[PDB]
Each structure stands twice: as C-alpha cells, then as structure tokens.
Ligand binder design. Structure first.
Ligand SMILES: O[C@@H]1[C@@H](O)[C@H](O)OC[C@H]1O
Ligand SMILES: O[C@@H]1[C@@H](O)[C@H](O)OC[C@H]1O
Ligand SMILES: O[C@@H]1[C@@H](O)[C@H](O)OC[C@H]1O
Ligand SMILES: [Cl-]
Ligand SMILES: [Cl-]
Ligand SMILES: [Cl-]
Ligand SMILES: [Cl-]
Ligand SMILES: [Cl-]
Ligand SMILES: [Cl-]
Ligand SMILES: [Cl-]
Ligand SMILES: [Cl-]
Ligand SMILES: [Cl-]
Lengths: 317, 316, 317, 318, 318, 316
C-alpha cells in the first residue's frame, strides 16, 4: 500500500477539538454506577491446554446489563503475586478466544485475561437492539449513549480490571491493559475510567475522532457508520449518531488517562487512519510515547512487539 | 458468469430435508409464544409527496415483546383493499423502502414493509447468547430458541395477523412478497400462517444452508463460514447446522399451500441457483420458477412484469 | 467509497469559465432549424402492462436526421389534461425501456414518456460514424459538432417535448423534464433549448465540464474520451474534440435554463464527479436548488426521491 | 490467470454443430453483390514516417454502404512486385492506426495495409443504428443480418483484398491476411469470402461459436451480447440475435477457407476462450495448424511470432 | 474464499506417480557429500530480547557452497538438555527473523532455531544465478538440479539439524522440525535427508507435486514457474525445469520420512492447493496424520496450533 | 488517472542529489574492476525467419566474471552500421526480446539486446549477502559493492565496449535505448561511458528512490518497502538508501553529455512522473522530455515516432 493520510509533520500536530458534550463525565459517572450495581460473581473453571508452566482457565463475570462476560485466563504456574494483563481483541478479530496469545503472555510472566468483546469473540450482550442499524456492531444502538453497543463493552473492560485485581495471585499494583485497534481503544478507555491499570499499550487504537474517521477511512469498520447514514438519510439521525459517538470517542477519553501509555501506528493503515490515531495520542496528557512505523498498516508490527514487551517488562515485570 | 449446477441439474436438485424430529414442534411452540404477546398495533399517519395514497408508520408487538415497525401505504379510496406484506433484503433497507411501499399502494395494494429486526428497522429484544461472526446470520446460532431469525419469522407471521385485522384490508386477498431474505420471509410466513393467499419470492435466501456455505461466493451466507473460522470446535458446527435446519426453506417449503412465484438468476453469487432451486423443488403447491440466465442477485425487469401480473391475477 | 473531489466548501464556489465558442448559440439555432425541418409524424400504439389505472403506449416520432425515436408512454387512466414528464435514462442504463418506472410515474399522476436515447436503450440513430472512436457513444463523431453523437440526442429530447405537449390529454403548461446522469444532462439541455418544460429535475447530471471531468472521473463513461485520445495521439485531435464537446457541455447550456431546477449530487460519486455537477449547477441562473448527499455516489438516493416527488408535485400536480 | 475452459484433450475434439441458416451462402452472395456495386475508387496519399527503406501511405477506398475505409499502407522501398499483407486489428485495440507495426511488416518485406475497422481504429461506418444495443459494436444492428455491424466490416475486409491486389507493385499471388482476435476473425472471414488471399494467419480468432462464447467468456467483448440481453429481456430478441450472429460466426465460415491457415491460442485466454477458438479451427478443412500455448492468454505470444514470421516467409516472401 | 480443488473424497485418494528420476537418491547422496565437505564452524552470539526465562542468540554456520546461514536461537533459561526445534519460515514471509515466535517456542520449553532461508529472511546464498528466471526464488537455477535454489536451502536445513544436535544443551534425541508452507516443505525435506529429527510438523507444505501445482494454484509463488515458462517458450526448457523440480518435490522425498509426522491443510488454500498437500501426505509411509480444516486457507489455523503444541509436547517436551 | 505532482510542479521538481562524497570514487573503482575482466566476447549465428538481417547470440564476460548475453541483429548489408544497445524492463524480457531486436536491425541498426542479470537472461555471479525482499531490487542492498545493479550497470558499460569493438559497427554512431529499467540502464551507461552518442529513455526507473518509495503505487519500487517491512532496524533503512544513492539517476544524470530523449506518462504508477522528471531535471545536456497525459507505464505510440525520428536524425 502507500501513504494517504496527513503528512507525518501534520499528524504530529493534529489535535481536533474535543466533541464531548457537557454531560460527558456525568454519563460515565452514571454508567459506572450502573455497573457497580451488578455483582461481579466471577467464576473460574480450569481449562486444558498443551503448555507447560502455565495454568489456563475460563473466566466469566457479570457486568453491565447483567451480561455474562468471558475470556480465557492464563496464569504463570509459580507462586505469585503475578503482574497481570487484560488483553482486548480487535473488532470481529477474535478466533477461539485468542487463547494461544493469552497463554504466551502468561509464558512471558503475566497473569493474562483476554476479555472477549460482547457478541464478537465471545461473551453475552443483553443490551437490546433499539432499531435498525448497519451490518455490524458499530451502529448498534447508536441513537443514544445509553443504548450504544460500546457502553456495555467499555464497562465490561472496567469490570474486567476489577475482577482481575481482586484475584489474590494477582499483584493489583502491576496490572496493564493492552490491545490492538478496537482492543487498543478498550485499553485506553479502561485506563480513563479506572485507575486500576498501571500502564497502557494500544496498537493503532480504534474508536477515535469519529467525525474525521468516516471521511478518511478506506476500509471497515468505521465505514459501517457511513453505511448506517446511507440507510437513514434523516439529517437529525446523523447529528444524533455523532452525538452518541462522542461519549465513546478516544479524543474525549484520552484526557482522563494518567497511566504511562505506549501507542503504535502504521502510516499506511487504512482501517484506523494515522490521523485518527494521532488524534487520540495528542489528547493524552500523561507519560506517553507513539511508535510510528512508515511501512506498516493495520497489522502486526514486529518492531512494535519488542517495544511492547520491553515497555511491559519495565513497568510490570 | 455461470458457476453453479447446470440448468438441467438444477431442475432436479432436491436435497434431503434436514428438519429434526421436533421441527413442527419447535414452530408450534414458537407460534404459541408469539400468540402470548398482544399485538397492540399502532398507526401514525406519515406525510409523503404522493397523491391517491395515505402513508402510515405501523408498529406492533411481537415475539420477545419486540416492537416491529414499517411503513404502511394504503390506496386513498374505499376498501377493502387487497394487501401485501413486503419483506426487504438482508441489510438492504434504506429509509424503510418507503418509496417502493408507496408505489405498491399506487398499484392498488395496501402495503406494509415490515422492517427486519435491527436491520432496516424494528427492535430486537432477543439477547446475544455469545460470540458470533460480523452480522445477523450467526447471532444466537447455537440454539433454535435464540437464533436471530426465530424472532424475524415470527414478526413476519405477526405482520400478517395485524394487517388482516385491518378493516380496510381484504383478509382473503393478502400476498407476501420479498427479495432474497425478503423472499425467504415470504415463504416462511406462508408456511407458518395460512393468512397469505399467494407468495412471491425473488431468489429466496436462508435455503439449503449446508450447500450454501460451500457454493456461495459472496455475503451473507459466508457469515456462517466466518463464524466457524472463529469457533473451530467441531461440535459448534454440528450444533449451528442443527439450529439452521429449523429455519431452512427446504424444510419449510413443504408447508406452503399458497400459489407461489419464484425467480432466480443463473449467475447469482449471493443466493446460488442451486439453493434457490432446492427451496423451489421442496414446494408442493401451485408454483412457478422464472429462470433468468443473464441475471444475478439484483432487480430483474422481466420478473417485475411477471410479479405484477401474478399479484394482479390473484389479488387485484 | 470515500470523499475524493474538491471539498464541499470549494465545490460551492467551483464555477469554471464557459468554454462555449463564439458560434455557440448559432450552432444550436441552426441545429434546432434542421430539427424543425423534420415532421414529427408521431405514432401511438397501445401496449399491454399489468397495471390498473394507467394506459401504456409505445410512442415513436421522427427527429434530427429523420431518426425514429421511441419510448414507452404511460398516462393516468382518467380524464385530463394531465401534467406530464419526459424522463431521460442514464448512459447505457436502460433496461426494457425503463417501462416499470414510466408506469409508476404515471401512477403518481404524470403522463410520462421515457425517451430512449439513440442506439442505447432504444431508438434509431441515422447519424453516420465519421471515423474511429473509443468503445462507446461518448466519442462518436467527436471531431465535429455537426456529427457528434449528442447533437441528435439533444434534438431528440427537444422534439420529445414538442410531441408530448401536442397531445390533447397533456397540459402543455405542466410539463417537467427529469433524468439521472446522462438523463439529467438531457433534462437540463432540453430546458435550455426549449421553453416547453416548466421545471427541471436532474440527478448528478453528466456531460458537464468535460475538460475537468476527464481529469477527475475515476470510472466510465467520461474516461471514454481519455481512451479516445490514447488511440489518436494527434494533439490537434484533442483540441478539436474538446472544441466539439463545448457545444454540448452543461456549463455552457446552463445559462439558458430559466425553469425552476432541482439537482442532486453524491459526494463520493466517481462517475459524475461532484465538481463537474457543481460546475453545471453554478452556471444556472434560475430558481434552483442542489441537494447534496455526503454518503452517496452515482446511484439511487432515497432522500432525493422524496425531494424529487415533492418538487414535481408542487410545480406540476 | 489459470486454466478454465475444456481440457486440452476435449478442446482438440470440440467441434460444435454449425449454426448457419439455410440462406447462409445466399446472404453472403447477396452481400458480396452489394459490395461489388460500390466502386472502390481507392486513393493513395504518401505519409511521412521516420523509417528508411519503406514508403508509407494513407490508403482509403469505398466499400459496403459507400463507407470510406482507411488504413496505413507501407511498401518496401524497392522494385516489386512485393508479397502483401492485409492486417486486421483487434476489437477497440487500434492505436494511431497500428502504423508502427504496419511499417515493420513492410520492413520484413511485405507491402502491408492495416485496414481500420469501422468506427474503431478508423474508417467510416455509414450503416445506421436500427435501435438500442449494448455499449460497444458487438450488438449494433444485431436484430438483422442485413444491419449487423460486422456485415460491413467483413465486406470492407474483402474489398481491402480487392484493392490491394489491384496495385501493380503487389504480387496478387502472394497476398496473406493476418490479424489477432477480431483481426484473426476478419482474416478467416476474408479468406472464406474471397479467394484472393493465399494464406491466413489468425491469432486466437474472435467472433466464433457465439452461443458458447457468451457462456464461457469471462471478459469483454463477447459479454456485450450478454449485456444486450440484460437490456432486452424479450425471448424472441435472443433467438433473433443468435440467428443474426450465425451469419458471421467463424464456425460457419471456416468451411469455405481453402488457404493454408495458421492459428494460435493461449489456454488461459479469457477473452476468446480456447473452446471457441478450437471450434473455429476444427471447422476448417484446409491445410492448417493450431499452435497451442499453455501459459498465455489474449496477448502477444513471442513463440507464435516466430511461427507467424516463418509461416508467412515460407508461403509469401519465399 | 471457497472450495475449488478436488473434493475431500478425491483428495484423500490423490497420490500422483512419483516423478523422481533414476538418479534421485544419487543426487541427494552427492549433495549431502558436498555439504559434509563444508565445516559447519558455527558461531553463537548472545542477543538481547525483552523476555524472562529465555536466552536468545544469533546463530550462524557454514553450509553448502560455503554459504553463511543464520537465524535466531532461543533457549529456555534453565539446565538442559532441552528438547529442540528447528523452525523454517514461509516463502518471503520472514520478518525480523521471526524472532518473537522463536522466543515463544523457547518459552514453551524448546531450544529453538529459526533458520533463515537463503536470500529471503536472511542468510547468505553464494550460489550463482546461471541465467534468466522469473521474479523470485522459485526458478533461480531451475535448469539444473545442481544449480537449483532449493538445493542449497535443503542442505542448509540438514546442516541446521547437525549444528543444533551438536549443542551440549540440546537433547539430540528430542529434536523436531517444524514450518509452514515453504517451512513445512523444508521440515519434510530435512526429515527425509537426515535421521536427526525425531518428529515433523508441516503446515500445508509447499514444493509439492509441481506439475499439478502450476495448473491448480491461483496465487504466488507456484505461479512463478508459470511466469518463467512465459519468458522462455522453448519446450525443452519446460521439460528440463520440471526435471529439475522433481529432485526437490515432496512427493519424491516423502517416502524417505520415517519420523512421526503431523500436517495441516485448509481446503480453501489457494497458495498450496489441497491436492498438492494431500499428494505429499499420501506419499508418506510413516506414523502420520493430516488435520483438515474446511474453512481455512494459507494462514494461521488456531485449531492446528493446539494440535501442533500437543503433538510436539507428546513427542518431545514430556 | 492523474495522481503525482501537477505538471507545473513536475517541471520544477529537482530534488537535491543524494550522492555520497565517494560517489565518483565508487564508480571509478567499479569501472576499474570491470576493466580487469577481459570481455572475451563470442558470436554465434542464430536462425530467425527474417530477410535482410543476420541474428546472433552474443555473450561477453563482465563484472564478477559474469557471462552476459543477448541477441544481436545486424542489417544484412555492408557496414559500418549505426548501432543500438537496447535494455529491457524489469522482469519484462520474453525470449530475449528478439523480435524487437530484429525490427531495430530492420530499421538499419546493428542492435544488441543486453539481457539483465538473472532476469531476461545472463549470468549473475554476485553472491546474495543476506535476506532481501522478493525480487532483485533489494539484493545486496546493504552495500554499494554488493548491490544488484552494480553488476548490471557495469554489464551495460561493457556491452557498449564490446559492440563498439565490432568492425561492422560505426563506433561514432552508437545509441543506448530502453524502457523504465531499460531507460535507467541507458542513462547510467551514458553517464559512465562516453561511447554512446545519444540516449533514449522511456520513463526511466531507479530514480529518486527516497521519493519513489512514497509515491509509487505498484511494483517494483515497493520491493524496497517490502524489504524494510522485513528488516525493521532503522540503520538498515539508512544503509539501504545510502546504497541506492550510488545508483540513483538523479546522481548519475549530471554526467550525461549525450543528446537525450525521455518520455513519461502522467498516469504512470510504476515509475511516477515526479521520479522521472527528477532524473530529467538533473540532466545538463542536449535534452527533451516528451510528456503524455493519457499514458502510463506502457508502450506510447506517439513516442515511438519521436524515438525513431530522434535516432534516425542522430544515427542514420
Ligand atoms: O472452540 C475452541 C476449541 O475448539 C479450542 O480447542 O480451544 C479454544 C476454543 O475457543
Ligand atoms: O532487525 C530486527 C530488529 O529491529 C529487532 O529488534 O530484532 C530482530 C531484528 O531482525
Ligand atoms: O528461448 C527462445 C527460443 O525458444 C525462441 O525460439 O527464440 C527466442 C529465445 O529466447
Ligand atoms: Cl438505535
Ligand atoms: Cl491496512
Ligand atoms: Cl449462540
Ligand atoms: Cl469523428
Ligand atoms: Cl438492431
Ligand atoms: Cl538456470
Ligand atoms: Cl488462501
Ligand atoms: Cl545485503
Ligand atoms: Cl501504469
């Protein structure tokens, strides 16, 4: 592929005005309160996996809307407490719960839980579908911040941290949140809504600068929003949709992140355009660093893996 | 270009039903749960730049207490009028297909375009049991009780019950029509309800799943393939296909007693000819399948005439 | 896909200098005169169609070059006079004469005639092919305004209006011309050459700002011109071709339109680039309005249908 | 691209039943007669070209429907008579009259004329457009053999041979017709309608076995027919169309070819499917040979150029 | 994608006749002898990597043609001997030496060496380029088994095993060879030429049933061969090329494998078509098993990773 | 379609040279290593169905003792004849481009189509130091001494030395021509040898690398991008570009003193207009760049006339 978004020089300076409504923090305050009203009631069931030195489990817990969230949980097979990681998977990109990577994270020394995102890689989503929406999760319940798909997801992410930190074999002071694109977005959103995480690693975070994303993205899933408007021409629906999205946009959440953060971005990424990622990064006011990779897009970036491992090792291991 | 079975083979393609022993029992129970939900329909007039037709926004309660909607256009003249319940295609509803609904009314039919749950409109209260591929095709696929289309099919039946209750509607002249997903709902509705008089289905979807996933070259059948890629458990595949059989047209076709008109393009890559012939060949009723060599999953002009002529003859 | 032409802000101000030669109106004056010399001699043959309340016919008439033009003609089955519509189809986009849409227009209350464009959806084209040209109609007889394909077409469009208005069941004071792409172009061209039309509706009009179109378009049929030049490298051939096209370019004809006009444009339209459509719109000095649709391209735009029906209803019904 | 049509074993045996109507030869007899009624009145205008040893001209002549046909004509700059070639270009594939190739053919020793196909690479087409048709020339006037686009084209091809052979610097007994795709079809059609040509070279000939082509081709321009039917659903239109096409189908003309013929075909050709080309070849009853190239499609095949040059050299230059 | 090759029923029975020439084993006997003549002279240089419990090194050694082969070598940071793995990467698919995966393999308890294939993911290739060839490595030196690209590669693979087993911290009786596509092919080839490996894991092995692959494959890199023939039309070149390829074709090497073998194949794999993989599998006469995945292609198959980890654990780790 | 800098900008695009301080020293040493290899050319007649031309297989020894080949066609008449050394495009040589070589001879030019190492033919003895992206673009890219094109450029020069030594060849009327990669070799040959009288380069490749990798939308420039994806080490990228500068046309152009004719299509995605104008704008010699708005990386008929006319004027 090739360069397409703003020049690197412009990207570094790209910092769009926040779109957060006056009731932004109030919405998250209320949302967190509804989550708190749901007892976690976590369950742990051992799971066989052909690995030595790691114990794998299937973890489930109750979250927003009384939804049962799941994911594999791998723990180093040695005395703890262990530093932990809550890993979030990409949009519709979870295969068999990403169990093999979860196990490898545990082999690296981290008690790791790969929270499966509602209705995607796993987990239950009790939230009702208010009405029509484009193919996908991007616009489900988009006409209201209370019904929006990611409201439950973000909360599940926070609840995931609360459950993990409660584990006695987990060192609550050494918990990191990581993920790619959608996963990176959940990581950042979790760090913004909970102070449990110590550090944050986000690979080309998704759900960022929506109003620009729909005009710059050249591939799914941002375009699901575009597809949604094509099916609902009502001008008010568009205003409303973007109004809803602002409550979940990383450029509005970034400011709450106080944890050391490591981000990555490929300049030829057509799914999460550089501009939208730099936008999130430029709204972060915390110990941070953005690794830029000229020749990579929305994919695994080997050089960034080293960075990631090194960063987590330094702050947690 | 041509790709599925030859036309000669297609005419003879009739795969063994995959219906489980509790097939009709499942639908009997499902219809019963629907019956337990009062329709409580509502009608709100809706402005539209047309003369001779009155448009409304119709809503009603269905399975799972979901609120189903759709525009309802009625010829602006004394009834009773023959009616049509039109079903839209998969993720293919734009602005409720209001313009086509209105035109159907201009053709003389009191028409209701039922919006399919979470797609073109309507509420879907059914919970998402677990992970599934991007789309609706695999939502709740691990159980016939939780499967996406269970609610949809019931909404379709309820739509007919609501429409026929209207005094301006001639209950004896109600037809069900639709394209692909819409065609599948039409056929499924006729199989579960005797309210419809005739059925028109354009290259019906949700048919012969086990073959569709091996022949289709485009979405949305492949959503199932994507689902299995994400859940390699062999039991998950057995289960999924077990679930799908309760909604597969080749198992429902047999219950259709209404005159039925179908269409199929031989280069259709979304609803492969074989899967459509399969549904057609399982129908034991007054039927006819219009084959169009040079068309695919799209509007077929020649079939519109056929369609208008068929509906006119049985309803107008 | 995604945005690609000039920004919306720029589009609103895009008004390229007319390319009309000094003999512009003289060419059309002469052309109209040659048309006038051909007796219409229209014929009406009833045609069976499964519809109630509408009578369909096959209408044919003689036009420029003694070509026999055809098209279905649907009339509300009630006492007239009826408001009428001359509908023009898109480039190579006529299927079975667009009869189903013609009938629906009649059901909406309009005596409608879908003029089939020469050699495309129907009708005879007696104009000779002077020499080589690219695959398609875009460059047929392009080396001279007298031989150019659209000369006959535009005249057929005018003649269509003359024939329809002559019908006793047609209210000559309530005739509108409509069409999409090529059809929108014929609509606008007909209103510029004839004062018979009362109103004009054009969906992303084609044949506009050719010199820019060949540099911005990303799909057919504008690129047929590009293909033509690839096959005739002679620099003079290119000057000549554009010289010819200027006599049919909407930016040069728009100024003659005095009828209320309604236009539409999708910002991601790659066939008739937004710039070329805004160009035509910005050259119109009449009661006008351009509906912009951010998320649509060269296709049916539901929201615009309402606009269209509402516009025609207000001016004709 | 990859293999897709019938297996090579099947292709060699593929010989579809002729689709020629009972008035087939009568149609061509009448058609040739109408051509004969139009005086050629050829004209020759010298044309400058940066080459040594060759004289280039612009050649024009009157043909069917009084259409003015053109094309460059290159002649070796030495005393004749010279062996000649009438080269036909591919569908919508003529750039600047293919002048550079015409000149090279002359450098190879052949007085060469690249007849430009009506409305495509050049030449005038006076034939009227009866009615609607798909984008392209494939379906123009397809509802009647008298109005069909290629009627004039085929006749132009024959007239081209008559004009060329009349030239004193041309050895009428050493004239070959060559072409690729559409050009190969015109070559074969010209040899079938005129005995002027001595030999024939056709690269993956087009306009062959229409009824199958529309079901096997995966690219233009055969699919123009498919597009046409999509726009005219009337079943009678399809019967008529194929009726018309049969009068121009190579499988029905091949049998009249008596000249030595050399053909080529790439097995991954998606424009002129192998089956449709083998069909034309298998209907030829004359000194013939079909060069098969497994790894090539609808494109220039180097190995076949050698074959071609060698074949022409043997039958004409030699 | 979608199904396209032979049906599963046919695939299970697909076993093409070997194409090995009469001097097959003689060629490999001589080739191994030339390798033996090159002293390994391995070198080990520690390499920093952000991991705990594993020591990483850059390993290099001399192989066929005195080429210096490299790759990262990760070892569990605990007392050995350790079971080992020689991992081979896919065609042009090595990024930064696949170091992250090498380390993870070591975390699973395996002393792992990711041999970088000549000129691809790393390593030196001293073999000269005899002449023209298609873009890529597939046809380099294809006109002779002595000059063919993979001759050196296969030998590097065998040498890799010899070097690893010589390490004192490596349990020579618990060495496994694994790889995907090209990597799977090297794994199988190494087991066929060396008895050092105990078990073999090959994910949809490449370099198998060449003569069919070039007719079934729909993506690179098999088609490089097709591209090569397009550029060298000489019929003898094709005979020669396939003659050369037979000495490296898995269907001819499979028979020498005596080690327990685990293979995988996606039925919609367009790079290494199912038929070509079943062909290699059906030529294996040893403790074997082929995991078939209906919905996967040429990619990472999660279900097969479990199979793989479980298989290696059973035969090596525990 | 248009995509690079505007034509107005292209005419002014002249990027700073990237030549290292040892630029000419590298080429001086390189030419010296070539000189140390005796040409030892061989000529073997080759049958070809043509009249008036004699074809031969020509081979000679070059840098690294590599045996370079190519067909050589000579007008079958008394010489001396003007000559042409034709270079083929990247991976674009089929059967040695023999048919074109013959046609060039028919136009009156003793022509030799040098086959580029390992591509259209010829032997490449240069070792592969290490890993590199699929293709020749990055082979030995970590050092100017090992880089693929070092041998190629020298083979080009050696080709001229061999041809001019032929008695039937008029050493004062030798032109070098080629497209893209071939155009680049032509220009590089004219820069390193004064044997060529004139130069014709069709949209020359290997030009302004640092921009090419950011503007190109097709192969083979992107091979470099692929290389960096496989070797993330930042130093590897600095080194690679350091290597490439020794072969970049923007750094060699200045040495060209021969009349030069270039062509460029404005929609060329393989050799972007900017990279070609870059090479052109670095030429300080009798020159001319033919711009073709509607063409890309392909045969441009109009330019063929230009080309034939230019060569005729300077050589015939
Ligand atoms: O369904 C998957 C199962 O088959 C695999 O064994 O372990 C991971 C699960 O997600
Ligand atoms: O070049 C790579 C380096 O950047 C990475 O850090 O380690 C692996 C190497 O291959
Ligand atoms: O190998 C080729 C040969 O077969 C052909 O005849 O002439 C050109 C050569 O390159
Ligand atoms: Cl909603
Ligand atoms: Cl990407
Ligand atoms: Cl489920
Ligand atoms: Cl013209
Ligand atoms: Cl016709
Ligand atoms: Cl070789
Ligand atoms: Cl694949
Ligand atoms: Cl290197
Ligand atoms: Cl290009």
């Amino acid at each position: 592929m090739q360069l397409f978004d703003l020049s690197l020089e412009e990207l570094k300076k790209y910092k769009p005005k926040k779109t957060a409504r006056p009731d932004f923090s109030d919405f998250w305050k209320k949302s967190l309160e509804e989550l708190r009203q749901v007892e976690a009631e976590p369950t742990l069931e051992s799971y066989d996996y052909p690995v030595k030195g790691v114990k794998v489990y299937r973890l489930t817990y109750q979250s927003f809307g009384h939804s049962k969230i799941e994911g594999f949980y791998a723990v180093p097979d040695q005395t703890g407490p262990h530093p932990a990681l809550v890993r979030f998977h990409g949009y519709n990109a979870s295969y068999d719960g990403g169990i093999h990577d979860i196990v490898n994270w545990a082999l690296h020394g981290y008690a790791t839980f790969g929270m499966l995102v509602r209705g995607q890689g796993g987990s239950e989503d009790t939230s009702v579908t208010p009405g029509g929406h484009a193919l996908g999760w991007m616009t489900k319940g988009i006409l209201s911040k209370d019904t929006y798909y990611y409201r439950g997801v973000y909360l599940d992410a926070v609840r995931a941290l609360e459950v993990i930190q409660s584990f006695p074999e987990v060192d609550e002071h050494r918990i990191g949140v990581i993920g790619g694109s959608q996963g990176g977005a959940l990581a950042i959103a979790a760090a913004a809504l909970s102070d449990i995480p110590k550090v944050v690693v986000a690979d080309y975070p998704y759900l960022s600068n929506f109003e620009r994303a729909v005009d710059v993205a050249l591939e799914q899933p941002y375009l699901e929003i575009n597809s949604y408007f094509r099916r609902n021409s009502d001008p008010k629906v568009e205003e409303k949709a973007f109004e809803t999205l602002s409550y979940f946009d990383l450029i509005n959440l970034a400011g709450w992140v106080k944890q050391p953060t490591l981000m990555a971005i490929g300049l030829i990424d057509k799914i999460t355009p550089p501009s939208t990622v730099f936008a999130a990064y430029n709204h972060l006011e915390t110990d941070k660093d953005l690794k830029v990779y000229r020749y990579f897009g929305h994919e695994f970036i080997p050089a960034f893996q080293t960075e990631k491992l090194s960063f987590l090792q330094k702050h947690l291991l």
